[PDB]
Design a protein around this ligand. Structure first.
Ligand SMILES: *[C@@H]1O[C@H](CO)[C@@H](O)[C@H](O)[C@H]1NC(C)=O
Ligand SMILES: *[C@@H]1O[C@H](CO)[C@@H](O)[C@H](O)[C@H]1NC(C)=O
Lengths: 212, 218
């Protein structure tokens, strides 16, 4: 289909340009190129419908241009809000609409935010399903990158761990979660369990014990 | 003005996928708006399935066109999409769409409905409480939603009467292939003894709704 870079970035207040490249028949041939914005977990939103033009809601920080077979979207005066995935669409023939592969846009001047970690032991109601789940919830942090490690007593646990990829949230910061699955017996057979979240060289460790 | 998508969230392989869209705020009758379907796939960007307008003017995506059937009912305000010989490559979030102009731009978009293509069977979630882990004057409490298939679930609190301090985390795929997620709300600590907190979990693919009250551990 159409080709656009996998990712792009800029600082707050600064400008970023992303490109959509097409065949003579697709962008070079016809005027119409649309651009769409998608925040994660939401439907896409129209930003441009004709290469220059803007819909009534859309901010002037968004501008489009074209040169030959190449289409450009420019975001001027970046805001944390603008961080999202952007797509480009062009007509292929009378019979067809074509989509670019999408570009992940990050704003690169933003303040660090330490994660908030909440650790939950298996509920009593769960422990007699004959199951056990430790729940480590990580929120309100930036950049969106963490490492999670689990400890049984003082020794590392690899077997039961499942961890999400971090994703953006309404507040514009990032959330992630990690789960440790155990049998009730191994849960009861240790002094304590710990969840360690490492973010930007600093760590937060929470501990829960069966005795609680 | 607003769009809604409906239909099965799970389809078995080699079987046909049927979806319906209902439009509100607009006639489905105007000069000239085509109405349509576009989809998004995991590991890739958007793919235009195509759009139809009355009487029977249609556009179809190549390769897709052979399997794909699309009909418009103007009277109901409903449009329908059919796709045959569905294969795992068709697992996607499907969005209802209003085409504008031959049309080239899409707005507005429907919220979208997940469709998973698999031979595995549907399974409702097990909901377990997470008891209140405090910050002075504010405690976090939640619900663990374990082992459901397929996506999605929705979570609200106190039948929607609670919105402040509510956060719902993205789900985890697991080695089992069952999903799990949890949702948490931040509440005043003084309220824990007097107010009852209930999470409302809805899972349309299995028609399961679970309302779990969460009690403070003693
Ligand atoms: C697209 O083509 C333009 C031509 O100006 C080029 O400058 C740009 O780097 C290209 N981008 C990609 C992703 O091919
Ligand atoms: C239907 O899809 C399946 C997927 O494996 C494929 O093998 C088969 O060739 C398709 N049928 C036709 C008639 O193309």
């Amino acid at each position: 289909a159409l080709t656009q870079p996998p990712s792009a970035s800029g600082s707050l207040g600064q400008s970023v340009t992303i490109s959509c490249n097409g065949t003579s028949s697709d962008i070079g041939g016809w005027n119409f190129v649309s651009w769409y914005q998608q925040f994660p977990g939401r439907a896409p939103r129209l930003i441009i419908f004709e290469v220059n033009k803007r819909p009534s809601g859309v901010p002037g920080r968004f501008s489009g241009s074209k040169s030959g077979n190449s289409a450009s979207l420019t975001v001027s005066g970046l805001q944390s809000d603008d961080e999202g995935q952007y797509f480009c669409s062009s007509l292929f023939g009378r019979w067809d609409v074509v989509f670019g592969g999408g570009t992940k846009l990050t704003v690169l001047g933003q303040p660090k935010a330490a994660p908030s970690v909440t650790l939950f032991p298996p509920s009593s109601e769960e422990l007699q399903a004959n199951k056990a789940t430790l729940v480590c919830l990580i929120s309100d942090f930036y950049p969106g990158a963490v490492t999670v490690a689990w400890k049984a007593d003082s020794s590392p646990v690899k077997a039961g761990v499942e961890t999400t990829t971090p994703s953006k949230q309404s507040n514009n910061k990032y959330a992630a979660s990690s789960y440790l699955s155990l049998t009730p017996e191994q849960w009861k057979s240790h002094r304590s369990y710990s969840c360690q979240v490492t973010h930007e060289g600093s760590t937060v460790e929470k501990t829960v014990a069966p005795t609680e | 003005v607003q769009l809604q998508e409906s239909g099965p969230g799970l389809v078995k392989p080699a079987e046909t996928l049927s979806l319906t869209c209902s439009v509100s705020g607009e006639s489905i009758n105007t000069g000239h708006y085509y109405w349509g379907w576009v989809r998004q796939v995991p590991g890739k960007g958007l793919e235009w399935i195509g759009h139809i307008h009355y009487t029977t003017a249609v556009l179809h995506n190549p390769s897709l066109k052979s399997r794909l059937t699309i009909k418009i009912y103007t009277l109901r305000n409903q449009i329908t999409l059919r796709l045959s010989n569905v294969t795992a490559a068709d697992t996607a979030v499907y969005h209802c769409v209003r085409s504008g102009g031959k049309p080239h731009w899409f707005s507005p978009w429907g919220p979208g409905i997940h469709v998973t293509v698999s031979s595995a069977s549907t399974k409702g979630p097990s909901v377990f409480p997470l008891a209140p882990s405090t910050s002075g004057g504010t405690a976090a409490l939640g619900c663990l939603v374990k082992d459901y298939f397929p996506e999605p679930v929705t979570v609200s609190w106190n039948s929607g009467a609670l919105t402040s301090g509510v956060h719902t985390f993205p789900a985890v795929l697991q080695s089992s292939g069952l999903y799990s997620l949890s949702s948490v709300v931040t509440v005043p600590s003084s309220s824990l003894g007097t107010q009852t907190y209930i999470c409302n979990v809805n899972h349309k693919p299995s028609n399961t709704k679970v309302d779990k009250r969460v009690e403070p551990k003693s």
